[PDB]
Amino acid sequence: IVARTPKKKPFFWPEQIAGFEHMYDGNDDYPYYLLNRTDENSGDLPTQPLAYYENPEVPQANAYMLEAATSAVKEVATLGVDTEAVNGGQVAFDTV
Amino acid sequence: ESILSRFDADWTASDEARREAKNDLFFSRVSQWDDWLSQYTTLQYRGQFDVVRPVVRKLVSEMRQNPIDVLYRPKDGARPDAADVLMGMYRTDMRHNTAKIAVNIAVREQIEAGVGAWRLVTDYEDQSPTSNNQVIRREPIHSACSHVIWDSNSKLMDKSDARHCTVIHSMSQNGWEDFAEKYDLDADDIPSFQNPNDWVFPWLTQDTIQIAEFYEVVEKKETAFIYQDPVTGEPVSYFKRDIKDVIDDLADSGFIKIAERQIKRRRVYKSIITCTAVLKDKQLIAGEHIPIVPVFGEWGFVEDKEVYEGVVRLTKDGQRLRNMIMSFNADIVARTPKKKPFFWPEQIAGFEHMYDGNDDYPYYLLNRTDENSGDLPTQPLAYYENPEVPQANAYMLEAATSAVKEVATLGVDTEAVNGGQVAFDTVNQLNMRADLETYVFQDNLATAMRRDGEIDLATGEKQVLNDIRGRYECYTDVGPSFQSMKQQNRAEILELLGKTPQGTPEYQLLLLQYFTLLDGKGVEMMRDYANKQLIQMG
Amino acid sequence: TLQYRGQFDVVRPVVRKLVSEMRQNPIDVLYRPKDGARPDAADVLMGMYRTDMRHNTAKIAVNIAVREQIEAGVGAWRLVTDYEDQSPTSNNQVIR
Amino acid sequence: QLIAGEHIPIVPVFGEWGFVEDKEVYEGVVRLTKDGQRLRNMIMSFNAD
Amino acid sequence: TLQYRGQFDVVRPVVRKLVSEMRQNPIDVLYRPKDGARPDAADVLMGM
Amino acid sequence: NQLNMRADLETYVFQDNLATAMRRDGEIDLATGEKQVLNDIRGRYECYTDVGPSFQSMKQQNRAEILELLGKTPQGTPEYQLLLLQYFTLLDGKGVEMMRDYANKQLIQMG
Amino acid sequence: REPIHSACSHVIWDSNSKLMDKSDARHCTVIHSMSQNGWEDFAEKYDLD
């Protein structure tokens, strides 16, 4: 799930680009964010693209079901000791 | 041919120890550096986290306050005086710093992997030595899994039934020169081998220089040639033949008592050979059974394949994934732009100053009306979103730390003594006890060199290499780490102090304390009146 | 395969736990004498018993025991006849 | 030239040491800490900007 | 460079911590005398 | 750290033979004159290497272990003999000198 | 007695010391880095140009 994923970056459309591609991806030195605007024909009245790719969140089915795996596991292992740290169900095996 | 069969044991041993060498050597990769295999230092970043050293130093710390020396109590039988000098020789040359180094190898290879070992051979040093003018040489070395291999189908971890004892020394050129000089061979023989070390070698160490040592185990069947008491009375002493060389003449001085009884011994032998050809086969060894003691962690037979390992193995899994996340997260913050408004390019070109870097102009005006267009600009108000971690890999870092803390749980009580680590100590116990066995065998060949009799009870025994074969009456056992026999007896004195009734018994034990004292005029005079009342009270 | 391989379990914590509690209490043998004539009978018998059962092989048998008793329900160790002449027991034997 | 104490004239002291390939590693915990440290420190300067 | 430089660490708290605990207990030498003839041997030796 | 400290001791003792060993001892005052440059007996390693806390002087070492055994000792005679030994070990000033005086006084009077 | 920093880069035990005390190592290769005046005084006490 985390091994096969892309990153989260805005999704614009290809005629808003081709003049810039520098101060946007890897530049912290240019606090200037301008993409293209008007193209031949088109509208041209571009709306807000603002399209981002969603980060993975674990389904919460398999999540609390890992809580349920640990659950079942700790269910079938319970032996324990007292404050004296001697007794508990393990003694049964000792008896055998 | 000998060298061929020794290459057979070398081959099988080296196979199962190539699988276990991959494992435990990858353990060492994890500990000394990290989990990173395959790509090394690529265009991505490299983070490191683990938990390793906290848990390691934890358990090592508890086992290093309780190093577990040897008890080896005397016989159940005739006399409980037998520990006698034997603890004198034991601690005399085991009080050296090399013993705790053997412990360091032990726990180091017992946490990551399940292994460890240290070497004991025969050296003769004339500087305030032990009796017979000898000292045992101790050499614990790392990568003991890939150094020594027990694959003679040892049924037990001590490997008392294994004939392999195949152990290599990897060193530099100067150590090869000195080693070939002390062991008397030419320095030009070029002793390469199949290598102990890592299988990559990305860095600079190109010297091979590996010398092999093999040790053979047979029963030897000692026979007859037993003598009697040199002064004639209480006859029938237990003496040897084979260790005695051509000179018996000092026993021909009026001792010289003959008897014949066939016996069955157990005797090993030493040999040193490299990968190229046979060098030295059948050279003198001292301690029968194993010359070099292994120590063990969790071991098992699946297909009857040796598995020597420890918990860290499983931990490694979570570890690698854990570490990756951070480097991954690194790039998340490493490759990002900043957050600034996204307008469109015909709203600009007249200003570009009081907007980006100016705090002096609280005037925010972009362009508005352009030729043609609408011109009716809407609110651009387009901002780039700051990174937030997916929360998949986030609580899955909670799940990496989870899995890791799952597979490491030992802990202590409010008393801060016990806990599951003791289990390893218990296995550790055997290891210590194990060496004792071989140790005792050394005693007969190296220094036994005194005898005892019925009633001063101490025999002079003036000759080289003489003793009685009845020396194993002592049984093997182990105990805490004690700094000297003065401090041992002091220790158990304190053990019985305070649990004793405040009447006479507390006072006699007390007087025994007043006897045992160290130095300074005060302790000398308190010792004086101490011994004074001791003798006055009979 | 082309997928990844993770590993977790709980196993070794529980195993080492119970093995640790049984390894502080290895459970040797009493074998008390007769109800009858004489209670001196343990006599040499415990001498022979422990003499060659004090060896490290016994706790190895315990390791087999608990190891195969946690995962599975089993374990065992072999005892046969050997004759060793180095400070042996009486009759000049040791059990293997 | 004349020396007095036999064996080593100058005493070393040691922390955690090991042999990987039989390569000397003398080190302590701070090593690993350094990693987090550098990244940690960067954040602040980054936050500064 | 044109960027800024911050510093944080944890270092000196932990360092000075452990150094502080080892510096209250500097660990001198016992070097006790022989097990044997005389336990007077520390004698001048600790003096020097 | 222990080993490290102990380590130097080894080399230290070796210095002793070449630099200053410079006294000898015998059976019974037991102290040998040994008037010459660089003389000693090779039997000097009878001492075995061990380490301990950091102690400021032999007076303060013996004082320290005096305190170590003080308080764990029965309030009867033993506490009083160890006590008198404390009264022996004292530093300076007329008070400690006179308490030391009657101290040694009773020590010798009690044999 | 002269403890000095950078002891890792000053003295090297690489004679294949098996133990941290390096009782088996023959290297004992240790350097003194100093200024000019300390070089003058050191060459004076140890008698060199």
Chains F and C share 3 or more Cβ pairs within 8 Å: no
Separation between Cα atoms, residue B441 and residue B92, nearest integer Å:
17
Strand partners, B123: B135
For chain C, how long is the longest CA-to-CA vector? 75
Residue with tokens 């043609």: B372
Closest chain D residue to the Cα of E10, Cα to Cα: D37
E9/D44 CB distance under 8 A: no
Q: How was this structure determined?
A: X-ray
Separation between Cα atoms, residue B522 and residue F68, nearest integer Å:
14
User: How many angstroms separate the CA of residue A28 from the nearest CA in chain C?
Assistant: 36
G28/D10 CB distance under 8 A: yes
Residue with tokens 């001492």: F47
Under a CB-based contact definition with an 8 Å cutoff, are residues B135 and B124 in contact? yes
Q: Where are the beta strands (DSSP E) in G1-49?
A: none
CB nearest F3 (choices: B100, B507, B520):
B100
Write the DSSP assignment of B111-164 as a string of letters: HSSS--EEEEEEE---SS--GGG-EEEEE--S-HHHH-B-TTT-SSTT-TT---
B-chain CB neighbours of E33 within 8 Å are: 518-519
Separation between Cα atoms, residue B178 and residue B277, nearest integer Å:
20
Closest chain D residue to the Cα of F8, Cα to Cα: D11
CA distances from B246 to B107, B241, B251, F69 (A): 46, 10, 12, 59
C-chain CB neighbours of A90 within 8 Å are: 18, 21-22
Tokens of B43: 């265009």
The letter for the amino acid at B13 is: A
CB nearest B423 (choices: C9, C20, C60):
C20
Under a CB-based contact definition with an 8 Å cutoff, are residues C70 and C15 in contact? yes
D10/G13 CB distance under 8 A: no
Burial (CB count within 10 angstroms: exposed 0-12, middle 13-18, buried 19+), residue A67: exposed
Under a CB-based contact definition with an 8 Å cutoff, are residues C52 and C79 in contact? no
Tokens of C26: 């290895």
Under a CB-based contact definition with an 8 Å cutoff, are residues B126 and F35 in contact? no
Which residues of B touch chain F, with CB atoms under 8 Å apart?
A: 92, 95, 97, 100, 127-128, 483-484, 502, 506-507, 510, 514, 518, 520, 522-523, 525-526, 529
Closest chain B residue to the Cα of A44, Cα to Cα: B373
Query: What's phi and psi for B294, nearest 5 deg?
Result: -80, 160
Element (H, E) at D16: strand D16-19
Other CB atoms within a 10 A radius of the CB of residue B141 amount to 23
Separation between Cα atoms, residue B7 and residue B10, nearest integer Å:
5
Element (H, E) at B321: helix B312-334
The closest of A9, A8, A20, A10 to A48, measured between CA atoms, is A10
User: How many angstroms separate the CA of residue B300 from the nearest CA in chain A?
Assistant: 21
Tokens of F66: 């005096």
Overall residue count recorded for chain E in this entry: 48
Tokens of C35: 């109800």
Which residues of D touch chain F, with CB atoms under 8 Å apart?
A: 4-9, 11-14
Tokens of B58: 């934890």
Element (H, E) at F14: helix F2-18
A44 upstream amide cis, omega within 30 of 0: yes
CB nearest G21 (choices: B97, B139, B172):
B97
The closest of C82, E33, E35, F71 to E43, measured between CA atoms, is E33
**Does residue B273 sit in helix, strand or coil?**
strand
| Torsion from C-alpha of B303, B307, B310, B316, nearest 10 degrees | -80
In sequence order, what are the residues at sequence separation of 6 or more whose Cβ sits closer than 8 angstroms to the Cβ of residue F93? Answer: none
Separation between Cα atoms, residue A45 and residue A59, nearest integer Å:
39
B97/G23 CB distance under 8 A: yes
D8/G20 CB distance under 8 A: no
Separation between Cα atoms, residue B184 and residue C44, nearest integer Å:
52
The closest of B127, B121, B128, B109 to B56, measured between CA atoms, is B109
Tokens of B23: 């494992």
